[PDB]
Short mmCIF file of C-alpha atoms and ligand atoms in Angstrom, two decimals:
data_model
loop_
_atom_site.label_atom_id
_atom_site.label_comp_id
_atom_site.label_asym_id
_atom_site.label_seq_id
_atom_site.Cartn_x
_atom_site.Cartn_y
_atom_site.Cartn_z
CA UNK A 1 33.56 59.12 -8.01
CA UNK A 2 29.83 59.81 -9.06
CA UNK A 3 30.30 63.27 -11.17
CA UNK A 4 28.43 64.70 -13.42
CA UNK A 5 28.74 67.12 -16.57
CA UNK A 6 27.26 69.66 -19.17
CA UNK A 7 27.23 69.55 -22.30
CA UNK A 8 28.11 72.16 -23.73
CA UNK A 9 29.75 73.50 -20.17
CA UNK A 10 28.82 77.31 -21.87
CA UNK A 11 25.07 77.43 -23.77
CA UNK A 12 23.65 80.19 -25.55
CA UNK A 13 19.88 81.19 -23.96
CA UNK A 14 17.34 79.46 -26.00
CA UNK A 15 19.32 76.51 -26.65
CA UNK A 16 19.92 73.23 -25.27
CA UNK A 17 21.62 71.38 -22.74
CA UNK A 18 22.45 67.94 -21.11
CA UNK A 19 23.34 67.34 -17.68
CA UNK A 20 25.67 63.97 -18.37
CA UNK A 21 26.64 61.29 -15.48
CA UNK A 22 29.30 59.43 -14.95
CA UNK A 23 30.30 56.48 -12.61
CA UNK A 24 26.90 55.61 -11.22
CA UNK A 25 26.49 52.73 -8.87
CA UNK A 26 26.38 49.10 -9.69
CA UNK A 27 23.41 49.61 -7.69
CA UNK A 28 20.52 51.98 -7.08
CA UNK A 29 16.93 52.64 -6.31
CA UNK A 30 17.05 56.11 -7.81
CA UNK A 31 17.60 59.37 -8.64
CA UNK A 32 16.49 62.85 -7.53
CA UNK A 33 17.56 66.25 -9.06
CA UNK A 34 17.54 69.97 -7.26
CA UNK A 35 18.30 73.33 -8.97
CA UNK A 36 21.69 74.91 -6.65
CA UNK A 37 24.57 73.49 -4.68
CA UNK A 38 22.48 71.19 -2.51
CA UNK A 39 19.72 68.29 -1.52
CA UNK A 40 16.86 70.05 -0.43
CA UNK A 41 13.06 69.10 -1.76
CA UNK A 42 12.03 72.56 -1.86
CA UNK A 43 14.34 73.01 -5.08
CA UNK A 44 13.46 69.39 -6.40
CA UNK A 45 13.25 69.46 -10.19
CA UNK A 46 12.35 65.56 -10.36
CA UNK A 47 12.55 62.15 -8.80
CA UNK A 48 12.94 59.21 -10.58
CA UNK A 49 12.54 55.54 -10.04
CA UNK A 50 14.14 52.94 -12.29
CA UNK A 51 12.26 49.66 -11.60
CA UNK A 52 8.96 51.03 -12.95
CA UNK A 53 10.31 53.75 -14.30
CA UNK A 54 8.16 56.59 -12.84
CA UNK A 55 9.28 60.24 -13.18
CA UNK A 56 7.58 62.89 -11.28
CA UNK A 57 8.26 66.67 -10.55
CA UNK A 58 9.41 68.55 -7.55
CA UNK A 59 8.63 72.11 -7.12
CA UNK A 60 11.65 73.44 -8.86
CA UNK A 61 10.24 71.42 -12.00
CA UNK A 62 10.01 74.21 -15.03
CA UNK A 63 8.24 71.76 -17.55
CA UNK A 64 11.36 71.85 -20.09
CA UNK A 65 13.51 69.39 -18.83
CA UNK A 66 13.41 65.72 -19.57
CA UNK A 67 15.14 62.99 -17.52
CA UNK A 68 16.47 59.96 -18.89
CA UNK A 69 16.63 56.50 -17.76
CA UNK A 70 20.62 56.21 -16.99
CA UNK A 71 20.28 59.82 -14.95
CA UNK A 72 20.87 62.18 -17.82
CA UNK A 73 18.50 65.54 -17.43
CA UNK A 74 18.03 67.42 -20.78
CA UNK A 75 16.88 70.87 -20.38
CA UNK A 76 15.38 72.89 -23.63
CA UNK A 77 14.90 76.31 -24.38
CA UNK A 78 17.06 77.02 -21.44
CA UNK A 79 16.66 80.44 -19.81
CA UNK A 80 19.22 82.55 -17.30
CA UNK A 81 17.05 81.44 -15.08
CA UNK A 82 18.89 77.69 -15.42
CA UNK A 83 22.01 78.99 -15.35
CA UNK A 84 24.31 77.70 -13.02
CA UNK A 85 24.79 74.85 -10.42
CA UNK A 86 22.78 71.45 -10.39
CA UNK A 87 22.89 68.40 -7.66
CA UNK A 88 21.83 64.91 -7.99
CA UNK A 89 21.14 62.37 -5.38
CA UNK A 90 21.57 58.78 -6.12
CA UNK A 91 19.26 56.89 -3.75
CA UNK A 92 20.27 53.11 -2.30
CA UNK A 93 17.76 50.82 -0.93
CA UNK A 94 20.21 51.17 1.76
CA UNK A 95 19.82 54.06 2.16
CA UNK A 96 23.65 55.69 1.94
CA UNK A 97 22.92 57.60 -0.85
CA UNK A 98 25.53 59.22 -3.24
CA UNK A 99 25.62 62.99 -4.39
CA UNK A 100 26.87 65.05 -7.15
CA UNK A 101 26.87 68.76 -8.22
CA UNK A 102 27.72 70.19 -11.65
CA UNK A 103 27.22 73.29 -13.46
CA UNK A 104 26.86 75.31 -16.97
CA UNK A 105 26.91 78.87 -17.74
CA UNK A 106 24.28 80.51 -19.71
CA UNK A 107 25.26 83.65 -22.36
CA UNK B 1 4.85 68.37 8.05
CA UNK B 2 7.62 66.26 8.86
CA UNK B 3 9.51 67.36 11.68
CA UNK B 4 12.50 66.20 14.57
CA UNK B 5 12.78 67.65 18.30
CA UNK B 6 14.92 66.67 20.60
CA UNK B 7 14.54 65.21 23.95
CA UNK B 8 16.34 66.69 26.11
CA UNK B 9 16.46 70.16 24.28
CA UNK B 10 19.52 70.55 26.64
CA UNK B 11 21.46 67.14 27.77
CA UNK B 12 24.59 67.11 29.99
CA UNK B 13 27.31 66.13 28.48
CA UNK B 14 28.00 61.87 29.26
CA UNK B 15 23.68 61.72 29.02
CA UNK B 16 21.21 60.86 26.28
CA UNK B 17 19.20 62.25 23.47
CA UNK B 18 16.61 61.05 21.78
CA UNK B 19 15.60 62.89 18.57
CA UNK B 20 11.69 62.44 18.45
CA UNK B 21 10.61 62.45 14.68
CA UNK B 22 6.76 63.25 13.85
CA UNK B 23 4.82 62.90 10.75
CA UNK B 24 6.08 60.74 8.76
CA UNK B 25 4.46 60.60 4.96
CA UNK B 26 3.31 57.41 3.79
CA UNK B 27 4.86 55.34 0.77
CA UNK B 28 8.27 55.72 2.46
CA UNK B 29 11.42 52.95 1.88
CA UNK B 30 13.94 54.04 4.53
CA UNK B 31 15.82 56.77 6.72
CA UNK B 32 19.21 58.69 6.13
CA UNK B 33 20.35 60.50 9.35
CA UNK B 34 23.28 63.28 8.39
CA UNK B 35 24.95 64.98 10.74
CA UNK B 36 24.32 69.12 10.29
CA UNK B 37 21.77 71.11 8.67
CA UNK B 38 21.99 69.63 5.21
CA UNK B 39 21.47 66.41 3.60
CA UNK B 40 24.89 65.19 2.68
CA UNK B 41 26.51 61.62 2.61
CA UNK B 42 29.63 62.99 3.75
CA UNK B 43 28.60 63.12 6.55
CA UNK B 44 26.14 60.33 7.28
CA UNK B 45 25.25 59.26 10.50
CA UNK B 46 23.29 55.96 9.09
CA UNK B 47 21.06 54.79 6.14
CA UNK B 48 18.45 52.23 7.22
CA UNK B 49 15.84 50.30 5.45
CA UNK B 50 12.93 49.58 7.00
CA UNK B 51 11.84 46.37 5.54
CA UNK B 52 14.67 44.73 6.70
CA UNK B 53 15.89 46.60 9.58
CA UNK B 54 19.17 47.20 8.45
CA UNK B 55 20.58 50.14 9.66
CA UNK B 56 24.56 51.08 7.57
CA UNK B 57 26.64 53.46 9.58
CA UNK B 58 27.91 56.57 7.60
CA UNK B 59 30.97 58.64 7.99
CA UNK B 60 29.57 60.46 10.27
CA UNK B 61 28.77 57.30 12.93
CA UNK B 62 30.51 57.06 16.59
CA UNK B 63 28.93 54.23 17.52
CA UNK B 64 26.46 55.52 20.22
CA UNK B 65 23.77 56.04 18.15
CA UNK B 66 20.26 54.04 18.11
CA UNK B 67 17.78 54.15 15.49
CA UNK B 68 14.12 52.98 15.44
CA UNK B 69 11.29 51.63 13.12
CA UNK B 70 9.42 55.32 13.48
CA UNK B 71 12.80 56.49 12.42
CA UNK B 72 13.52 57.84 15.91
CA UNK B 73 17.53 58.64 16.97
CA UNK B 74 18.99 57.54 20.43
CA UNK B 75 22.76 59.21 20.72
CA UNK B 76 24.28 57.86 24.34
CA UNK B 77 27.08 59.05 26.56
CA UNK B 78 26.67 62.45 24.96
CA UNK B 79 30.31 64.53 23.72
CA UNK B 80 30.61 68.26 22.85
CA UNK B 81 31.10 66.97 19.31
CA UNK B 82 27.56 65.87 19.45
CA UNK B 83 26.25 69.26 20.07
CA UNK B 84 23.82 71.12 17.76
CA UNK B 85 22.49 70.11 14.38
CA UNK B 86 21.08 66.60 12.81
CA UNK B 87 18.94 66.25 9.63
CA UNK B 88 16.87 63.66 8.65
CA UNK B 89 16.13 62.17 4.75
CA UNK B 90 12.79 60.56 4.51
CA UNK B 91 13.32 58.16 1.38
CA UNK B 92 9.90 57.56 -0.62
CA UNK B 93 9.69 55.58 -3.43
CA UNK B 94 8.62 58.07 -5.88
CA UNK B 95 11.94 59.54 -5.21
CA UNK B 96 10.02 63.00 -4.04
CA UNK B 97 11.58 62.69 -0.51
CA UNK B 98 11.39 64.43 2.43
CA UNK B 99 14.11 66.28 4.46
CA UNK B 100 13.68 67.47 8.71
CA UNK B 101 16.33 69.62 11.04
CA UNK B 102 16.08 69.24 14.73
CA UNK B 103 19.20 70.17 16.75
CA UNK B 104 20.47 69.89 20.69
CA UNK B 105 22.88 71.74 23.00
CA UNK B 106 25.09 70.03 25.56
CA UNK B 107 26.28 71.22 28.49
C1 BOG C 1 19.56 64.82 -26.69
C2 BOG C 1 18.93 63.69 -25.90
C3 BOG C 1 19.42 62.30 -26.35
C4 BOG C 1 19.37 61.22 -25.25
C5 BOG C 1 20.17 61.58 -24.01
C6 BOG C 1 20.76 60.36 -23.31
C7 BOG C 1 22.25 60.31 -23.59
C8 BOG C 1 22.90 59.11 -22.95
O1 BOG C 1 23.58 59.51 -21.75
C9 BOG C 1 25.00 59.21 -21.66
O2 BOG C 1 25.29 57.86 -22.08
C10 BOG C 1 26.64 57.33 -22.00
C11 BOG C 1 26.63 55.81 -22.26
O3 BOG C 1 25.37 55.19 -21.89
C12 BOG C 1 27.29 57.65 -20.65
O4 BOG C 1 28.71 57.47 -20.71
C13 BOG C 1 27.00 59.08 -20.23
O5 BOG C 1 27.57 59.26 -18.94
C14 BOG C 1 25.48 59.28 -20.21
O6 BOG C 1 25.06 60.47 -19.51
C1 BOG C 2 14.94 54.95 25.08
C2 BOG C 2 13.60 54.80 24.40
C3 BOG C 2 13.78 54.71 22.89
C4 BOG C 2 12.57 54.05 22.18
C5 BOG C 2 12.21 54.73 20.85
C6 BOG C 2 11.53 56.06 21.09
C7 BOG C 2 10.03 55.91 21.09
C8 BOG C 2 9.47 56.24 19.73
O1 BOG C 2 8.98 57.59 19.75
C9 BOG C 2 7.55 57.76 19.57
O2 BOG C 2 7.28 58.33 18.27
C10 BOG C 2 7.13 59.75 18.08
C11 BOG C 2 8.42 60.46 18.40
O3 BOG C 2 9.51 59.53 18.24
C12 BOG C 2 5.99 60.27 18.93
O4 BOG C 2 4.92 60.39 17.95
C13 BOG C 2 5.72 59.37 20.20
O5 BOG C 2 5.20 60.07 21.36
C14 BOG C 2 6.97 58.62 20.68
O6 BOG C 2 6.68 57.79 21.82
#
């Protein structure tokens, strides 16, 4: 149900992208993003917290992406390096969180 | 930092387990317990909130399981399908969680 997608799905290097999302909860704490296939703080790019609205970086952060407040993650000046899968979290205060993966390819 | 062992590192099969969990970080809002080595919400044993105790059984759940305020996991009358690998989701409210894999072997 919870999906997400790139736009564009094929990006030149040195250009831009946005990691879309679709289908979010009617209800949710947050969100966390991680670079690759799965959940794993080690490859955390960012958490996110919508009641006061407090972004802060993982390891995996870069310094060229830019979440936004409905889940979006815009990355700039995108490198090979980015290319490739990325997985977000949804966290519930109930803790039965949702997950999604998605992907672009860089040229 | 955060870490799981199980007690008994071997349990009979039709016994108990109890996964220990140490070091919990502070400025935390809840536990997910997955079954296997990675976080993943298909196959959730339980998401529980602390503040209010209550604990929402995932795909994963049998039924025999027992989880505490320190976030500790009892799993009772013990079946082969039990066996091995558990991973634990620290939720903190900056989103920047943390993740633990203990595992157990029955016999
Ligand atoms: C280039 C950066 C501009 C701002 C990026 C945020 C774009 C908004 O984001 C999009 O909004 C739509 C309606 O709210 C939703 O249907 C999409 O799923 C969502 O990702
Ligand atoms: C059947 C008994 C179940 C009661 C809950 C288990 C007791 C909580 O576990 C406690 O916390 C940590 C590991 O869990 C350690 O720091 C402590 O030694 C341990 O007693």
């Amino acid at each position: 149900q919870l999906t997400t997608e790139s736009m564009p799905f094929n990006v030149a290097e040195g250009k831009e992208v946005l990691l879309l999302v679709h289908n979010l909860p009617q209800q949710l704490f947050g969100y966390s993003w991680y670079k690759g296939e799965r959940v794993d703080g080690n490859r955390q790019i960012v958490g996110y917290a919508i009641g006061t609205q407090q972004a802060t970086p993982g390891p995996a952060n870069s310094g060229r992406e830019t979440i936004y407040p409905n889940a979006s993650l815009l990355i700039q000046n995108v490198t090979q390096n980015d290319t490739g899968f990325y997985t977000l979290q949804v966290a519930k205060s109930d803790l039965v969180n949702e997950e999604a993966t998605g992907q672009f390819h860089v040229y």
